[PDB]
């Protein structure tokens, strides 16, 4: 419940959480996928 009241209730903060999250999510997604591709293709 705290999160809603803190980062998801004020639209400005909603955007902030979205943008920040997206900033981190991507690199990771790329890494994970890339890694998987690599494990999947060992050569």
């Amino acid at each position: 419940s705290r999160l809603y009241s803190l980062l998801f209730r004020r639209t400005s903060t909603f955007a902030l959480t979205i943008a920040v999250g997206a900033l981190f999510f991507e690199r990771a997604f790329d890494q994970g996928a890339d890694a998987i591709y690599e494990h999947i293709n060992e050569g």
């Binding site: 591709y37 999947i40 293709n41 050569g43």
Partner: protein, 78 residues
């Protein structure tokens, strides 16, 4: 035309997420050169396009060195 249909084979890249075996691409590039290069050329392909673990760049340039024709050694001397 009745053509015996190609008997689908199990290629290491046949799968939905299955990539190519790059050692096989390197061996097949050798095949082209020694055998078919006689009567077939990868025009749209270039030694720079040979960038892949199959062949690294410096060595590829050596391949690039091997070939030596119509570069235009002489522009006035054509």
């Amino acid at each position: 035309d009745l053509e015996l249909h190609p008997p689908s084979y199990p290629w290491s890249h046949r799968g939905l997420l299955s990539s190519l075996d790059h050692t096989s691409i390197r061996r097949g590039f050798q095949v082209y050169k020694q055998v078919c290069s006689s009567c077939h050329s990868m025009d749209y392909v270039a030694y720079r396009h040979l960038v892949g673990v199959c062949y690294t760049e410096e060595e590829a340039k050596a391949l690039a060195e091997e070939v030596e024709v119509q570069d235009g050694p002489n522009d006035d001397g054509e």
